[PDB]
C-alpha cells in the first residue's frame, strides 16, 4: 500500500466542502435538457431588476398602500416629501426589496445603486421634485438648502413619467457591511441619506385630487457585487413543517 | 493522460463587475439619461456616467458568490428522522420542505435542475436526549414509489437486492453520497399551479407535483437500538441550473405541502412615525 | 491558484463514474440580465426620450 | 507518507458501489467462455417479446383460462368486448406479463407498448373489432362512439389471424411513473385507457360454438425505456429459505 | 499535464546574508565613514571593512526564518470557549486578541493581509475538569454580522442553510480549514488611530476599526452534553503581507480592544546600580 | 480504492506544518491589493534599523532619562564613561531595542552589530571618547589602557555629531546562542564587551552646563541572522483578555 | 530537496480549489532595507560627511 | 492533504493479499543465488513424474507389499486382477500417490492421467493383460465382455517390461471436483472405472513361482491442471508442536 | 476524495522505517558543512585499522599487560606460545578488539582476517615462530608437528619487527554467524584456531631479559562484511541516567 | 486486466526501497519437467522400443 498520513480535518463535514463524492445510481441517465425562457446564472441578474419599495412605511399604513408615498399640494415652500437612511440590511424600506432581500443573504455589498420615482397624479397635475444624496459624516439635511448640496437631480412631473437618482458608489473602502450589528458597530458602514424634497410645488386644476403619490423603486446599477453568504434574519421556524 | 483529461475539468471564476468611465458636465437638449418612464416594465437605463461627473475605475470585484451554483453549493439540513429503541426503524420522505432554510433559498426560482450530495450524521441520545455511547452500524434504504417499504427491523426487505443502500457507524465518520438529477420532468418545479390528478380539484391536492416526489429514506440499526439516534439529513445542491426568478417567500413558512401564511399584518418592513424622519 | 486577483481557477477532478459525482462548477456562466431589466420589443437607447 | 484527509462517506458501504476490491483469489484462471445461443445484453431485449396478458382476470376464473378474453355472437349492435387502465405498474393484468414484471423492478418508464390480438374462433367465424386507446385526461370511454375518437385500429378477422392496435407514447413529460403510489399522487402519470369493441359482430354458420376468444398480447416497442431500479412488490419472504 | 501545473508553484528559499570583503589600512583625510549624523533620521552607512581590517567571507547563512511568511506562518492559539452542559451552547469572537503571543507578534506591523488556516481541538472533561470520554459529534457555524444567532442547543438556526459550517467529532481528529482575506479593506489594521461610527465620540468606540470584526463562530453539541467541551481555536497566518513596522509591545496587554497599560514604572530592561560596572 | 498504510503521525496536529487544507468560503473574491507605503518582507529589515538603547539603567533612572548616558567635565585622567555586556538576550539595555526585541522571538543570532553615539552638548562644547569592544574570554576591561587593545574608535566631538562603532562579527562558531541559560551553561556564548572611556575629557567655557549626553543606538549589520522562534519571556498573561 | 546548503527548494501542491487554501509561501521576496535604514532625499554615501 | 474516502475492506488481513509492504531490514544485501540442480517452477512439473500406487489396498496387507497387485496363474479363463475407481480425490489407491497428494491440496482438476504397469515375474513367465477405462454412467465392469467396449490396452508379457494404459481426459465439463463430498453431491464428477483383466493366462514353466506382480504408477500427462487450493485432509495437529 | 483502502500495518511504527515524515521546522537554514578531517562512510573503514588483541588473558592478569604475550627463553624443544578460538563473538580475546567490538553489533560476518605480531625483546634477541590457522572440525593442534599441517607462517625476529599471519576466509558457506548461541547450535559456525609455536627457540646473550613479550594485533582484510545488526551484549543499564 | 482468457497482466508497483517489500511474483516461468521425468543419458523416442 502506499505509505500515507492522514493530517487534521480527517473525517469532518463541512457544509461548503467542494469534493466529489460517490453516486449512489450511477447508471442513472436524466431526461434532457430542454429550452426554458429565462434562464439565470447569477443572482445579480435579479439585483439589477426594479422592484418596488415599501416606502410608506408610517404606523398604521397596510397592504398595498405602503408603495406610495404622498404627495400633496403645499401650503408652505421648500418642504420635504421622504427621507430614508441608506441601508441594504436592517428592516427600513430597502430591506424588504429584491436587492434588500438578497442583501439579507449576503454580509458585504459594493456598487451604485439607483433610485425610479414614478408620478402617480392626473395629466393636468404638475410639479417639481428635489431627489438628494447626501454621503454619510451627518444627520439626514435638515432643508432643502443641505439637501442640495449632496448628489441631486430635479424632476419635473411630465409625459416621461419617471426619474432616476442614481446613487452612487461613494465610499472610503471597497466594501460595506450589509448589516447594523451593534456590537460589533456596523455603523461604521453608514453609507448616508436620501431624501426628497418639493422643487417648486404641486399644483393642480380646481377641484382635482389634491393628493397623488410616488412609486419609488430600487434597483443594483452594474458595478454592484455581494460577498459573505449568511442566513436570513426573517426567514424562521420553531417547529419541523408537516 | 487523455483519458484521465476526461475526468479533469479546467472551470474559472473569472468574471468581473462592471467599471467606470470618466465623464464630464453636460448642458444640452440632446441626451436626458434621467427620464424615464416605469409604466413599459422595463428597468431604468441611466447610468452613473451620465447623471453626476465620474472617475475612471478600473473593475475588479468578482462577481462568483452569487452565481447559482455558489449560492445554492452548500449543505443545508432536510431531514431529522428519529429512530426509536421501540422498533428501531424511522423514515424520511425526500423533499426539501420540512426545513425553511434551503426551501426559502430555493423560493428565488420556479424551475430547478441540480444533482444532489446527501450527508448524514447520526446521533445517539439517552431518552432525556443526553449524548451517549452506541456504536452500531445502520442502514439507510432508498425505497422508490411503488417499492414494499419495511415493517420492522428484521423485515426482509432490508435484503436491499434492488433499492440502493448506505451502510455506515452510529459513530464513524458521516455517509454521504450524490444523486443525480432524477425528475421525470425536464428540471424540478418549486411550485405548481395545477392539481396532482385528473378528475380531482380536491384542495390536498392542489398545488402537488409529484414529479418532485422520488420516494422516501428508510432507516434502521442493524440490531435493535438500545438508545434512539437521530439522522440529520444533509442536502447540497450541485450542478445548478435555475429558470424564471420569483418574489422571494416574505411571510413565514406554515404548511410543508402548501403555501398557506398567516397575513394577519400586511407588511414587510418596520414602521414609524413619520416619512420625513427616521 | 497560488494567488491577476478575482480569479479563481480550478481543475475538478472527479474520481466516480457518474458526472452527477462531481464537485460544484467553478465557471462563470453568460449574464443576459437585459431579458429580464429590458424585456421590450423597441429598445430603448439611454440618451432617448422613453415615451414616443 | 502522502498527506490525506480522508472525508465524508469514509469506511462507508453503497451497495452501489463502483469499485475496485482484491481478489480472494489472484492466480485463479476461469474456464473460457463457450459459445451459447441467446446471449442478453440488455433487458429491454426481453421486453420487446410478445408474452400474453393475463386478460380475463373476473372474479372465478382461474388458470389457463385466464388468458383467453371472451368473444361470443351478440344480440345488441357495438358492444363492449374489454376495457383495461393503460399501467406498467398496480396489479391488473399488465403487471404480471413479461413487461409488467420487468415494470415491476423500475420506477420509471418511457416508450410505445404494442398490443398484439390472436383471434381463436373456427376457421368459418368472422367477425370485426374496434380496439382503442384513449389518451387520460377522463374516464373510460363509455360507448363505441366515444371510444372511437381516439387512437384506434379496426381489426377484421380473416386468413392473418392477428392485429396489433400500437399504443404510441403520448405523454405531457418524457417519462411516467411505474406506480401509483396513492400517498405520492402518482395517478399524476395516468397513461389512459385501452377499450376493446364490437365493430360489426361476430357472426358464425348454424351450429358452430357461439363463443370464441381472444389471445392478447403485449410487448414494448423499441422507443421504450425503464429508469431507477426498485425491489419487486410481491416477491417476498417470511423465513430464510431451507 | 498543464492544468495540473497550474496548481503547483515552485517556491525557493534561497535568500543569502551579506559577506564580506577583505580590506587593508586606511591613512586619509579622502574617506571618513565613521562619521555620522543620527540627526538626519538616516541609520549608519558604516560597514565592517571601513571600520577594520576584514577578511573575505562568503555568505553562508539564510534569511528565511525572519521572512514575514515564516514568522507569522504558525498556529498560535486564540479562542478557548467552553461549552457548559446546561446549554450545551457557546461562541467565540473572531479576533487575535484573547491571547498574547500572537498579538504582540502581529503588533509589529500596522497593516497586514493574510489568508488563515484554523485547527479547532475539543476535549471533555468533568467538573473537576479532569479528562473524561465522551464521543460526540459537534457543529462550529460561522455566524456573519447580521445573521440570527443561536440561542439554544436545538435552535433551527443550526440548519446552517447559508451559514457555513464543520461537523467533527470530540474524539475524533481535529477540524481544520482555511478562510481567505475577508476584510472590506484592503488589509487588516493592528492599530486603528479612530472612531467607530461618525457623530460619536465614546472612548468605548475609539481604536476600534469594525473592518476587522467578521463575526462569530458558535458552538453546540449536536445532543446534549454529558460532559463539558473545551474548544481550544487555534489559528496559523499564511500568505502573508506586511507593511509599516511599529514600537512592538512592550508594555503587558491588559484590555481586549485597546491599548490600555499600567505604566507606573517607567522602565523595559533591569537596573544595576552603577554604569561602569555589571 | 488504492490500497494505502498510513503511518505514524496520522491525526497529528503540529503548528508548524505547511499543508493545503479545504477553504470554508471556496467562492470568495477578496478586494484588490492596493499600494501602501513601507511594505516589509523580511523582519531584518527591522533588524537593520537603529533604535534607541535603554542605556542609562541605573537604579533610579525613571523614563525619557534612561536614553542618556551622562558625560561630565572630568577632574581626573582616563575616566569610564560607560560598560555593557554584549547580549542580545537577558534583560540588561539591548534587551529592549529593536534588535533586541527581535532577539527575544529567537534562539540563535549571527552577525556584525553597530552601535551610533550621538553627542547632545552645547555647540561650545568640545571632548574626545573611546569606544572599545572585547572579544570575550576574561572580564570587563578595568582601564583604559587594557581596552585600548581590543577593536576600537576614537570619537572627537563636533560638527558631524555621531560615531560608530562597528561591532563585527568575531566569533569561533558561525552562530551563537541568543539566551544566557543557566542550566544549559549558554554562557558558553559570551560575546564580548563594550566600553566607553574619556579619550581626552569634556571641556566647557565658563558657566556652561557641566554635563551632556550620549544617546546610544543599536542596529543589525546587513551579514546579521537569527534563527530557531521561540517564545518571548516578557509579554505574558494570567487571564484571557476581556 | 535532498540536500547547494541555505537552500530549501518546495513544490508547493494545492488540492483545493480556493488559493487561500494552499500552504504557506516559501519563496524569499526582495528587501529593500533602504525605505527605513537610509530614507533621506540625499543620499549620503558611507565615505562622506553627512551633513553639508 | 489529498482528499481520499477509504471504503470497505479497509484494515482487513486477507490470507491471499497480493501487496508491497515494509521491509523490517531495509538494507539487508543476500547472499548471491548459486547454481543448485533440479529446479522447480511449477509443481505439474512434479505430478508428471510417476510414482507407485498403493495399489493392493486389500485389508491385511502392510507395508512394502501394498505396491504389488498379485498375478498368478489362473485356472478359469477371463479372470479379474484388478479394479479401481478412478477419483484424485477421496482415500483410495490413488490418493496416497505424488499425483493424489498434489491433489489433496486442489479442488478441482482437469487432463489425461497414465497409468504405467511392471511386470516382476521371471524371465520365463509369459502372459497378456487386458487394461480398461469406462467412462462413467453405470458401474465397474462386470466381465472382460463389458470391459473391452471401453478405452483399453492388451499388454503382452516380455523384454519391454511395462506398458502403458492412457486414460485420456473424457468429460462433459472442462473440469472436475478433486472431491466425493457427499452433501455437496461432487459424485456428479464421477470420472470412470479403470480395471485389468487377464486377458490369455499368466503361463509358467514347471515348479516355477505360480504368482507374480504387477506394480501399478500413475503419473500427469502435459494436458493436466490442478485449480483452488485447499487445506489437506490428513495433515491435521491436536495441538503446537514442542 | 480519492477511494483507497488502508491495507494491515496501518499505524504501526517500525523502528526501521524509511518513510519521509513533516518537519517541525521547515523554514531552518543549517550551519554550512566545513571541511573536517577523517571523514568516516563506511565502519568496515574503520574495520580495517588494526587494534590490539588483549590476548594476555590469563587469570591474574590486569590491565596494560594483558596486551602483551609473554614469550621466554626455552627449554624445551617445539613449546607452544600461545592458543586461540577464531571468533568473533563471546567473551574472548578477539571480542574487544575494533573487530570484535563491531562484531558485538552484527550477527553475521564474512570475509579473511588478519593478525600482525610485533614482538618487543632487545634488539639482540632472535627468534623464529610459527604461527598457525587450523580449519575447522577438529579441535586445537596438540604439538606444532599436527599444527603444522594448516595456514601458517614463520616468523623470524629481525629488523623488521613485525610479521602478518593472514586468516583467510575458508568456509562451507559465505557467512557464519558472529554468536556461538548454544540453543540455537550457533557453534555450527565454528571458524578454527590459531596457535603460536616456537619453531626455534629465544635466545639471548648472558644476562639479558629472559622473557619478552609478543603484541598481537587484529584487522579485517578488505573482502569482509558484517550484517544483520544487534544489540551489544555488554552495553546495558539497570536505571535511566542522571 | 479488465479481461485473451487464462492471461493474468499485472504491474506489480513496490513503494518501498528494498526488493524484498514488492509483492508476489506473478510470471510463469519455464517448465523443464523432462530433468525429472526423462533423467537419462540416452533419449528415448515415444515410438522406440525403451530397452536395446
Ligand atoms: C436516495 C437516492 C434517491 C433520492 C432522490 C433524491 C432527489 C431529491 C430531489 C428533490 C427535488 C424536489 C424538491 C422539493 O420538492 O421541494
Ligand atoms: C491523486 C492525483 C493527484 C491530482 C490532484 C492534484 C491537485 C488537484 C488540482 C487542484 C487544481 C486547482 C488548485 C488551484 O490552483 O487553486
Ligand atoms: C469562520 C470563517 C470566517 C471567519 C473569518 C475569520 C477571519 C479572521 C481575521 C482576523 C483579522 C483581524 C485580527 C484582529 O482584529 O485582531
Ligand atoms: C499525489 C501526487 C503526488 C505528488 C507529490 C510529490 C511530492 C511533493 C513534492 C515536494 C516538493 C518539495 C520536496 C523537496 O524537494 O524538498
Ligand atoms: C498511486 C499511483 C497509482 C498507480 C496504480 C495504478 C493501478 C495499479 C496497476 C495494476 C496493474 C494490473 C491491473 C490489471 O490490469 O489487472
Request: hydrophobic share 35%; with cysteine; aromatic share 10%.
Amino acid at each position: 500500500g502506499l505509505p500515507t498520513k492522514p493530517g487534521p480535518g480527517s473525517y469532518q463535514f463541512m457544509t461548503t466542502d467542494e469534493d466529489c463524492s460517490p453516486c449512489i445510481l450511477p447508471d442513472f441517465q436524466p431526461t434532457p435538457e430542454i429550452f426554458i425562457p429565462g434562464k439565470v446564472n447569477n443572482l445579480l441578474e435579479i439585483a439589477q431588476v426594479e422592484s418596488i419599495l415599501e416606502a410608506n412605511n408610517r404606523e398604521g399604513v397596510e397592504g398595498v398602500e405602503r408603495y406610495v408615498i404622498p404627495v400633496s399640494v403645499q401650503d408652505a415652500l421648500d418642504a420635504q416629501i421622504y427621507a430614508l437612511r441608506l441601508e441594504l440590511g436592517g428592516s427600513g424600506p430597502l430591506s424588504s426589496s429584491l436587492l434588500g432581500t438578497l442583501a439579507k443573504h449576503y454580509t458585504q455589498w459594493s456598487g451604485s445603486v439607483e433610485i425610479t420615482c414614478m408620478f402617480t397624479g392626473t395629466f393636468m397635475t404638475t410639479g417639481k421634485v428635489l431627489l438628494a444624496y447626501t454621503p454619510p459624516g451627518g444627520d439626514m439635511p435638515r432643508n432643502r438648502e443641505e439637501a442640495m448640496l449632496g448628489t441631486h437631480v430635479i424632476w419635473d412631473f411630465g409625459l416621461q413619467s419617471s426619474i432616476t437618482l442614481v446613487i452612487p458608489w461613494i465610499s472610503a473602502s471597497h466594501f460595506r457591511g450589509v448589516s447594523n450589528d451593534d456590537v460589533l458597530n456596523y455603523q461604521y458602514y453608514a453609507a448616508g441619506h436620501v431624501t426628497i424634497w418639493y422643487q417648486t410645488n404641486m399644483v393642480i386644476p380646481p377641484g382635482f385630487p389634491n393628493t397623488a403619490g410616488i412609486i419609488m423603486m430600487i434597483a443594483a446599477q452594474p458595478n454592484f457585487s455581494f460577498r459573505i453568504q449568511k442566513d436570513r434574519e426573517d426567514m424562521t421556524q420553531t417547529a419541523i413543517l408537516q | 493522460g487523455k483519458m484521465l483529461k476526461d475526468a479533469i475539468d479546467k472551470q474559472v471564476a473569472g468574471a468581473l463587475v462592471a467599471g467606470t468611465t470618466t465623464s464630464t458636465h453636460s448642458v444640452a437638449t440632446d441626451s436626458t439619461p434621467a427620464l424615464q418612464a416605469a409604466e413599459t416594465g422595463a428597468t431604468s437605463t441611466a447610468r452613473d456616467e451620465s447623471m453626476i461627473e465620474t472617475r475612471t475605475i478600473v473593475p475588479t470585484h468578482g462577481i462568483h458568490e452569487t452565481s447559482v451554483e455558489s449560492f445554492f453549493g452548500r449543505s443545508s439540513l432536510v431531514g431529522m428522522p428519529l429512530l426509536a429503541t421501540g422498533t428501531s426503524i424511522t423514515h424520511w420522505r425526500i423533499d426539501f420542505r420540512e426545513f425553511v432554510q434551503l426551501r426559502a433559498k430555493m423560493s428565488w426560482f420556479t424551475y430547478m435542475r441540480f444533482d444532489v450530495e446527501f450527508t448524514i450524521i447520526a446521533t445517539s441520545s439517552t431518552g432525556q436526549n443526553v449524548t451517549t455511547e452506541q456504536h452500531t452500524t445502520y442502514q439507510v434504504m432508498y425505497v422508490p414509489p411503488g417499492a414494499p417499504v419495511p415493517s420492522n427491523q428484521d423485515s426482509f426487505q432490508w435484503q436491499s437486492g434492488c433499492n440502493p443502500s448506505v451502510f455506515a457507524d452510529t459513530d464513524g465518520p458521516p455517509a454521504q453520497f450524490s444523486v443525480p438529477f432524477m425528475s421525470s420532468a425536464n428540471a424540478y418545479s418549486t411550485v405548481y399551479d395545477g392539481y396532482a390528478r385528473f378528475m380531482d380539484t380536491d384542495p390536498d391536492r392542489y398545488g402537488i407535483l409529484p414529479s418532485n416526489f422520488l420516494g422516501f429514506m428508510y432507516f434502521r440499526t442493524l440490531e435493535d437500538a438500545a438508545h434512539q439516534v437521530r439522522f440529520r439529513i444533509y442536502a447540497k445542491i450541485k450542478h445548478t441550473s435555475c429558470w424564471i426568478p420569483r418574489a422571494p417567500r416574505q411571510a413565514p413558512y406554515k404548511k410543508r405541502y402548501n403555501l398557506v401564511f398567516s397575513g394577519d399584518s400586511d407588511r414587510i418592513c418596520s414602521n414609524r412615525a413619520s416619512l420625513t424622519s427616521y | 491558484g497560488a494567488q491577476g486577483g478575482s480569479t479563481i481557477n480550478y481543475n475538478n477532478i472527479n474520481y466516480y463514474s457518474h458526472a452527477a459525482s462531481a464537485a460544484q462548477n467553478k465557471q462563470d456562466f453568460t449574464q443576459d440580465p437585459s431579458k429580464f431589466t429590458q424585456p421590450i420589443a423597441d429598445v430603448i437607447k439611454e440618451t432617448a426620450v422613453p415615451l414616443k
